[PDB]
Amino acid sequence: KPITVMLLGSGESGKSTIAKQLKILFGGGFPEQERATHKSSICSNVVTCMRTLIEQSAILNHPMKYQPKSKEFTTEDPVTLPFSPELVGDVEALWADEGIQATYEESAKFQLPDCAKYLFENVKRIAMEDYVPTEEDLIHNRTKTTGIHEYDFVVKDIPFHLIDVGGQRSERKKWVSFFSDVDCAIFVTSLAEYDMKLYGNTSRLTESIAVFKDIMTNEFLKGAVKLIFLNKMDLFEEKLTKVPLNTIFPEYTGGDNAVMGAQYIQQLFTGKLQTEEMNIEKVYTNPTNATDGSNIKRVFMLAVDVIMKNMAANGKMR
Ligand SMILES: Nc1nc2c(ncn2[C@@H]2O[C@H](COP(=O)(O)OP(=O)(O)O)[C@@H](O)[C@H]2O)c(=O)[nH]1
């Protein structure tokens, strides 16, 4: 029987990106027909993300040199099926325009999907008539996984079964207790959300923390190893330079140091629990960059050993 792993997290923690990444690395990836289903949302995101920046450049007074010609940037209507011929061209001009670039740097804050820059840098290839999304596009594109995804992979000749629990907090609860005999629960959280508000909970950070505190006391998850992926370490490093951590936690003295800062956030989730960073009741932690296949491969590897060691010591095996 396969080793079972359950992914939990808040929204926009990147847990769905982790799951696609493991299917690519250890599953069979995604076949052309599965990939082609993502064409419309990717094509749509190209336009909507850029409308966002144009609108924000007005709200934030960064005048534009360039002026869009295409049908697509004269309307708020949903995005049609084949792009107008001029769409490609003015996406490239727009992204190179001084005012748009200035607006992009003030990304904190309005709400710009993480995939924006990737979409723009890839527009020549996305706007082609015969374009079929690649696995890398699927990694970077934003999708809403209304939540219950299963699959199997193998790692170093050992069967794994992955349960990806999505949905509202209210249905997430339903599924956690449905699955029996889970060997490992992986909690994913976005480091870059430390400054984002909400309104029960006030901020994204406190909402994630309370989710995690659930996992730690959930009686159906006793027996399961608890791992935390502090995700979006890349985004967090950079974000720290525009929104310093002590503007959110004035009781913090570590400054620009993304390592010390990630630890500070990590310690807010784990309190008095014993913890262990896999990079050299007990909670294992590791920062991650889910859009980096190489990073997720190296990191899940450490994880397999932690899961195996633990199971051996708990009288479970294979
Ligand atoms: N830059 C960066 N983006 C990420 C990372 N992890 C996830 N994302 C992005 O976050 C967006 C949505 O995250 P998603 O996997 O759908 O979250 P979930 O479904 O709520 O668990 C996608 O556009 C991803 O490309 C990361 O480590 N780095």
Residue numbers in the entry: 22 to 220, 223 to 303, 318 to 355
What did the paper state?
To gain better insight into the distant homology of EhGα1 versus other Gα subunits, we determined a crystal structure of EhGα1 bound to GDP by single-wavelength anomalous dispersion (SAD) using data to 2.6 Å resolution. EhGα1 features the highly conserved Ras-like and all-helical domain structure and nucleotide-binding pocket characteristic of Gα subunits. The three switch regions are ordered in one of the two monomers in the asymmetric unit, likely due to crystal contacts. EhGα1 exhibits a highly conserved mode of nucleotide interaction, including the dispositions of residues Ser-37 and Gln-189. The guanine ring is embraced by the conserved NKxD motif (residues 254–257), with the hydrophobic portion of Lys-255 packing against the planar guanine ring. The phosphate-binding loop (P-loop) forms numerous polar contacts with the α- and β-phosphoryl groups of GDP. Unique to EhGα1 is the absence of an αB helix in the all-helical domain. Although the segment between αA and αC (αA-αC loop) could be affected by crystal packing, five prolines scattered throughout this loop (positions 84, 89, 99, 103, and 106) suggest this region likely also lacks helical structure in solution. EhGα1 also harbors a unique 16-residue insert in the Ras-like domain following the α4 helix. A portion of this insert forms a short β-strand (here termed β7) that extends the six-stranded β-sheet common to all heterotrimeric and Ras-family GTPases, followed by a 15-residue loop that is disordered in our crystal structure.
Here, we identify functional heterotrimeric G-protein subunits in Entamoeba histolytica, constituting a signaling pathway which, when perturbed, is seen to regulate multiple cellular processes required for pathogenesis. Like mammalian counterparts, EhGα1 forms a heterotrimer with EhGβγ that is dependent on guanine nucleotide exchange and hydrolysis. Despite engaging a classical G-protein effector, EhRGS-RhoGEF, EhGα1 diverges from mammalian Gα subunits and cannot be classified within mammalian Gα subfamilies, as highlighted by distinct structural features in our crystal structure of EhGα1 in the inactive conformation. Here we demonstrate that functional heterotrimeric G-protein subunits are encoded by the pathogen Entamoeba histolytica, including single Gα and Gβ subunits, and two Gγ subunits.
